[PDB]
Each structure stands twice: as structure tokens, then as C-alpha cells.
Amino acid sequence: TGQVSVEIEWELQKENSKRWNPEIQYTSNYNKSVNVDFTVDTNGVYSEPRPIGTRYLTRNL
Amino acid sequence: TGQVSVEIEWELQKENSKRWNPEIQYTSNYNKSVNVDFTVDTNGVYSEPRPIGTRYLTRNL
Amino acid sequence: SGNWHCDSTWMGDRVITTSTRTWALPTYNNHLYKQISSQSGASNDNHYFGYSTPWGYFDFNRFHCHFSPRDWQRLINNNWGFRPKRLNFKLFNIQVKEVTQNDGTTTIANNLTSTVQVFTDSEYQLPYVLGSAHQGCLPPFPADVFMVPQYGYLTLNNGSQAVGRSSFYCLEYFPSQMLRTGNNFTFSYTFEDVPFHSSYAHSQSLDRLMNPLIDQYLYYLSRTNTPTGTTTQSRLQFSQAGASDIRDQSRNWLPGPCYRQQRVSKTSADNNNSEYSWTGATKYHLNGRDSLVNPGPAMASHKDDEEKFFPQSGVLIFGKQGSEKTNVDIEKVMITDEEEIRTTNPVATEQYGSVSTNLQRGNRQAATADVNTQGVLPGMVWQDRDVYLQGPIWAKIPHTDGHFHPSPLMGGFGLKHPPPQILIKNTPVPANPSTTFSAAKFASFITQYSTGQVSVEIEWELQKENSKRWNPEIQYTSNYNKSVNVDFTVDTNGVYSEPRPIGTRYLTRNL
Amino acid sequence: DIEKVMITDEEEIRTTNPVATEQYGSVSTNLQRGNRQAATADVNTQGVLPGMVWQDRDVYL
Amino acid sequence: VFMVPQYGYLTLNNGSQAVGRSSFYCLEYFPSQMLRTGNNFTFSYTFEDVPFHSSYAHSQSLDRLMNPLIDQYLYYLSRTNTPTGTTTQSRLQFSQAGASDIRDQSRNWLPGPCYRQQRVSK
Amino acid sequence: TSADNNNSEYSWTGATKYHLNGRDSLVNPGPAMASHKDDEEKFFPQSGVLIFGKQGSEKTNV
Amino acid sequence: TWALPTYNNHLYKQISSQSGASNDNHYFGYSTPWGYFDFNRFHCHFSPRDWQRLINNNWGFR
Amino acid sequence: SGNWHCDSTWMGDRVITTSTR
Secondary structure (H helix, E strand, O other): OEOOOOOOOOOEEEOOOOOOOOOOOOOOOOOOOOOOOOOOOOOOOOOOOOOOOOOOOEEOO | OOOOEEEEEEEOOOOOOOOOOOOOOOOOOOOOOOOOOOOOOOOOOOOOOOOOOOOOOOOOO | OOOOOOEEEEOOOEEEEEEEEEEEEOOOOOOOOEEEEOOOOOOOOOOOEEEEEEEEEOOOOOOOOOOOHHHHHHHHHHEEEEEEEEEEEEEEEEEEEEEEEEOOEEEEEEEOOOOEEEEEOOOOOOOOOOOOOEOOOOOOOOOOOEEOOEEEEEOOOEOOEOOOOOOOOOHHHOOOEEEOOOOOEEEEEEOOOOOOOOOOEEOOOOOOOOOOOOOOOOEEEOOOOOOOOOOOOOOOOEEEOOOOOOOOOOOOOEEOOEEOOOEEOOOOOOOOOOOOOOOOOOEEEEOOEEEEOOOOOOOEOOOOOOOOOEEOOOOOEEEOOOOOOOOEEHHHEEEOOOOHHHHOOOEOOOOOEEEEOOOOOOOOOOOEEEEOEEOOOOOEEOOOOOOOOOOOOEEEOOOOOOOEOOOOOOOOEEEOOOOOOEEEEEOOOEOOOOOOOOOOOOOOEOOOEEEEEEEEEEEEEEEEOOOOOOOOOOOOOOOOOOOOOOOOOOOOOOOOOOOOOOOOOOOEEOO | OHHHOOOOOOOHHHHOOOOOOOOOEEEEOOOOOOOOOOOEEEEOEEOOOOOEEOOOOOOOO | OEEOOEEEEEOOOEOOEOOOOOOOOOHHHOOOOOOOOOOOOOOOOOOOOOOOOOOOEEOOOOOOOOOOOOOEOOEEEOOOOOOOOOOOOOOOEEEEOOOOOOOOOOOOOEEOOEEOOOOOOO | OOOOOOOOOOOOOOOOEEEEOOEEEEOOOOOOOOOOOOOOOOOOOOOOOOOOOOOOOOOOOO | OEEOOOOOOOOOEEEEOOOOOOOOOOOEEEEEEEEOOOOOOOOOOOOHHHHHHHHHHEEEEO | OOOOOOEEEEOOOEEEEEEEO
16 A cells, blocks of 8 residues: 555636626535535535536637 | 726735635526626616625635 | 828739728717617527627728729739738828708718727637628728728527527727827738638549550459359459540549539529429528528539529629619629539539448349438548639638638638727717706717728738640630620719629649 | 436537537438429438537536 | 556457457566655656647527628528419529528538437436 | 359449549549458458459450 | 555456357456556546636636 | 726736726
């Protein structure tokens, strides 16, 4: 057994968008349920509620 | 009559948050209505749907 | 303030052009944005959701703005290919006019220092309106003065409903330079390196490319039965490709891709007695909305003998001068026709060929089917559409990852960064304001409009003709007509006209 | 059974790429004449052709 | 804490039969560095230049890309019969692409390639 | 094997082709692709496969 | 933290299909003792927060 | 006489705004 350290250096492109009206963002909300997302259950078993796509922001064509 | 140019230089403090699970963000969404927010009506009269508070992000106490 | 420039000078490799016109800008929608949508006339394929703005923009995308028929003729004969390099742009001589009608008397009083504002964007941050070949080019003939077109754009929607994905813009949000009488505006632009256009048509067709005399060494299956057996048929036999058999001779490269079209005769007697055209009408669609296929992939219109038939859709149909806006009969409009691409690309009306179907056996007779559509396949070559004259120049590649060989389908130069648009607007000047405060938006205004001159200059780059051919060429020549009616010239009352379109493929290169 | 598994779904590419279930369109077939009525057929498959653009799939998480 | 997966690979074959083209490997045949407790291992790698991924979705559909107000100058075949003839039908007529007709308006670029799939309801 | 091949006449019955200007050009060696599966080995494509002649081959009907 | 067992008691093996009569399903391959750890997926590298923070503010990345 | 400015630029720590009416 042992430990492994993986490190990646990403490169980005920042958002220059000039749009007026508000955007669409990704937000986890609106649920008052006792069950919390992305967090252990009472007994420690992790879970993922739903997949997350990458297309949210907007550019004109 | 004439024109007036007002310019302000803000200073910020960036987000260092270490939190794991996803956040809450402000997002205009979920409405399929023909009526678009923050945009002129058919006859050109602007409108604001709802106020927007400043407290969204999260810090531990 | 500036010196009128309309002229062209020949440097050899490069040739410069310049033209200048007079423009007049009204004020649109009384200085307020609007939401515009379809009337909801129950046609689901036809709906739109968009915004009209006061901003004007003048947009030159067409040749005849830049080139005079003479210079066109002189360039089109002597050059293999050409592309732009830079361009320069200058406004000057701006002035403003205010119309006011006291009772019925219409009066125009000049004014000073009332400002016009202008901005371009080199950052390509706005919806890009040009490229759909809208009318409103700088007039062909320099004498006339033209109005500047209103702006506007569409957005995602469903019927009248607009999605939450839809966007919006406020154009004032950009740093517009301000102009006042006695001030002029310039900016220098540069075109990115792009392959030359092709001005030539090849002298030899693909299938016929070979040596007549020498037989190639490959064989091919000759005849199945020796004759007989017949039930035992006969063993296979083999012959060699030779001068007598052109079809069986073997070829490296495959003609370009195809798509079927419908054949419409000019003669009404031959055309289908019943109703067609949207019966009909090859189409594609998005989101359950079928979009009739407008000029499509390049291909040849007709074979040699017919000349009467023409494709129902792809061929560009221009109107003549003084043409009607609706329900005009053919004799008033010009049909462009391409017979020069027969050397490679397929005929439009015809099928692409036949293809094997069943896997034969003794009792199983061979079956084939006409192939109605063919995509790109390795080892294929094809020719791009002609640019004509009144046709468009450049179009913008939609900024996306997916691309294949970005050649626009109206013909032209696909640019990654087209010449930026220029937008122009009057500054709203308020009417007499109310004495006491009013919470109202104050919708009163003073009516006016402006005018000035615009100088557009492009520096082309050429490729000269090295052709070694012996016998005489084919050139473009206006001739043989003794008629009193002269081409490319005003009528007796001063209305300009264009007799026929002018294609770019005249000269010749071997394949 | 389905209720235990997540289905990813892309409605965001409607702007360019075709709908999966639907045909690509209709295409001319016969070469018409006075007695010959026009015929077409739904095109079931289309390869790449000049002047085409398309969008790449999402990467999810 | 997780277990490391076993290795393995496939090769050309027919059914149970393997061709003579099939290959084989003995992994010990490579210069493996050796590690003993108290030793660590590093290597630096570099990615080759590759186009950015696209995180965005466009705000306007292809078919709807145009100007609403201005009519383009091309025409299109309007209606075959003027009405009538009917047997003589009628000569072809022509109209212009306009705000009222979006479908007939002309476009430069064609939507991407397709392949059919089957529709299953939930 | 002539016994398995179609008793009747084929090959230009037949013969997948393309054309230009109303002249159908039989497709000679075309896009690359595999000729046969493992078991057959008897079957071969009718066109794409290059057919060379041996030494001293006949010019016609060999 | 990773833990590595020992596979097949240190010996290569030929593995093939059971020949369960489905011709489309067959394979011929070799199992080895070698282990390999393979990270190809995002959630190894990105935490849902950082994912959220990147996905909103950036056009593209490599 | 002046050049219309309505726009915002992001310097990181500081962000500038301008508007005109």
C-alpha cells in the first residue's frame, strides 16, 4: 500500500461576455428535504444526485 | 441639455471559500413564459421583476 | 474636409479600389427599443422573436459597390485568382438637418454641434447581421443617394414564447466615439490570409483524363458466359482496358458530393400539369421546423441538350431592374445557370449513380438501386460556386468547433474575423420639457436626420495569368446587339439597369 | 429498474445538430413531367457535406 | 481507500481460434525502476497543444439567423398555377423572401450530420 | 466457382457505377475496404480488387 | 491511499470466451499480474465546488 | 467634444464602471 499524488495544471479562458440581462447559472437549491446532496448519509455512504453538464453560459452564434 | 459621464473605481475582495458541496447562486430560470425579465415589453417599457439581495454566498460563523 | 476619392490604380500584383457615396440617416422607432415577434398566423415553421433598435448600420457586402463593370471585365479576364489584403475606411463631412412643419409648411433648418455617435467593434461581441445578403448595399451607380438600413436581430424562441436561454443587448453599453460637424473618422483593418478564389474552369473532364493510345495493364471482368452453358453458365473471362472501352478504364479520383433536386421546365406544357413545389421541395429541418433548402452544395444545373430545364431551388434567381416585390412572372427576372462545372461536380437533377444491392447466387438475380444522396468520401474533389457580381463577398464562419472546409454556400470568402460592422445613431434631442416634475419617461423629442459621405477603400491582391495555351481564348464581351437599348447605362429618364449577371469563370486551365 | 439510475439528456444542442429520433428531411426522387407526379423520400442517414457545422458532446463530470 | 485494478488485454481471434497475426507480450521486458520502502517516484509530463473545449451553448438557432426587417434580394418560385389552367396549368411566378416567410429565406450553412435512432417512451 | 455464381448474365446488369454528364463510368478500384470474411476465401469483389495479368498474358478474353 | 493485491499467483494466463454459442461474443486475451491505476474521469480531480466555480466563469479550458 | 463611455473593465482586485446619460 501507499499514497499517490496527482497534479494537473489547467489553462483557462475568462468570460468577456457583454450581455445585458441576467444569466443562467448552476445552482443547487429549492429543496427543503432532509436529504442533503453531495454529502454522506447518516451511515457514511457518499452519493451524487444528478449529473452536471458543462453548457450553461451563452455566446451569440 | 447635455451629457454626463460618471465613473467609479470599485475595490473588491475575492472568494477564498474552501467549502465542498455546491453553493447557492443567483439564477433567473425555470420560467417558460413569453414574458422576459429585465427587458423591454413589445412597446418598449422596461421593467424589473423582483429585487435582488446581496447575500447568497456563505461563510462559517 | 476630405477629398472625394473614387478611382482605381493598378500596381500589378496588387490593385487598389475606392468608392464614395452620400448617405442619409432617419430616426427609427422614435428612439426606443421594441420587442417584435411573429403575428402568430398559425404557421409554426414561421415565427420569430427579436428586437428592433434605433441603431443604423451601413453594410457593404456585394461586389458592384466596389467594382465598376469595366474594371470587373478587365480583372476577370487577366487573373487566375485574387483575395483582399487590407482595407481603409473614412467618414467625413457630417451635417444635420431638422425638419419642422408649422401648419402644413414643411421646413428644414440646418443646425450645428448637434452630435452623431458611431462605434465599431473589432471584438465580434454582437449578433452579426450581414451575410444573409439583404438589400441596402451602396447603390450600384455612384450618382444616387441612399438611406441607411435599420438594425435588428432574432433570438431563440418557440412560437411567440421565448425561452430563458434568450438574450438581450443594450448597444449604448459600448464605447462609441462621438462625432460633431467638422470631424472625420478612420480605422485601418486587415484581412487574414485566405486561399485565392478560383476564376478559372478546367479544360478536361475527370472521366476523360487518360492517354488515348496506351492501354493500361489492369484487367477487368469481360463476360460471364463464354456463351452457354446456359444452366452451367461459363467460367469468368477477362479483358484489358483499352482505347475502345473508356468506361472500364480505371481512375484515381471520384467526383464530388451530390444532393438531388427537382427538375422544372421553363415550358409550362412540359411541367407537371398538377401542383408541386412544396408537394414537393426537398428540405431539411430543425426542431420540427422544415427549412426549404435554398442554394445548396455546388453542382451543375443541366446537361448539354436540355438547357430548358433548371433546378427548382439551388439556382440563384435574381430580379431584373424595376422588378416586382411579389408574384412577378419569370420574364422580369434573371436566372443564373452554371454549365461550367460539368467537368467535376454532378448534375443536380440526376441521381448520383447505381449501387449493388443483393448478394447474388445461382437463383438470385442481381439487384441495384439509384443512390439518391452521397456524403463526402475519401478521394473526392469538387469546385466552389461562382461569385457573380451583385453576389456577396464575404461571410462569417459561425464560431464553433465543428467545421468542414468552411466555404460559404452563396460563394465568397469565409473569414474567421470579418470586417467589423459599423453602427451609427443620432443623439436624441429633447423637446420642450414640462415645467413641474413628471415621473414619466418623457417621450417627447425633436425630429431630425443627418447626412454625410463615406469612403471605402480595399487593396486587392492578384495572381497573373501564365497560360501557355495556343489557340485563342474565350473572353467576356458585350457585342452583337444593334439595339437602341444600351447595356449598363441610364435609360432616357435616368434609371440604371443591369442586363444579365456575370460569372467569374471564363479563362481555362488544364486539370 | 430505471428509478435507480440517472439518464443524461441534451436539449441544448437543438441550435444546430439534428434531433436523434427524427429523419434528416425529405429529398426529391422522380424527375417530374406532365403525367409524372412528384415523389420524395425521407432521408434516413446523411454523411458530412461541404458547408456544415456541428457541436461536440458534453463532458459532464 | 481503493484497490488497484488488474491488467489485461485482448487480441485478434475467431471464436476460440486465434490467428497467426495475434501478438503477445511479457511486461518484465521493460526497464522497470525498483522501489523500496523510503523511496519516492516522480515524473513530469506535458500535454500537447489542443483546442479548448467548449463550455458554452449558443443563443440563436441557425435557421433563425437573419435580419427580421430587411428583405433579401433573391427570389424563389412562388406558385405554379396562376390558378387554372388547369390542364394548361400556368406559367411560373416569383416572390421574394420576406419577414412573412422565414422558411424560403436563404442560408449559407447547413446543420451537422445525422444518424437515426429509435424512440422509447418512459 | 461457376456453379455458385448466378446462372444468368450479370456484370453491367449490374455493376455499381457513378456517372458524369449522362455517361455512366463503372466504378474501378474504389474506396479501400476488405474483400472477404474468413471462411469464404472463394468470393471476391467484382470490381474494386486489382486484377493483374500473369506473364505472357493474353490481351483479350483471357 | 491505494492497496495492491497479487493477481493469479504471479503467472500469466490465456483467457478466451466460454464459447457460449454467441459468435458476436467471443474474445481471446491475456490476464497478467500487473496492476495499473488509471485516472480518467473528472471527479477524481475536481470537487463539486470547484467544478461549479469553474463551469460558470470560463469559456474554455485545456 | 468627449467620447461616449459606457463600459466596465475587470482589473481583478479593482473593477471600473462608467455610464452616461
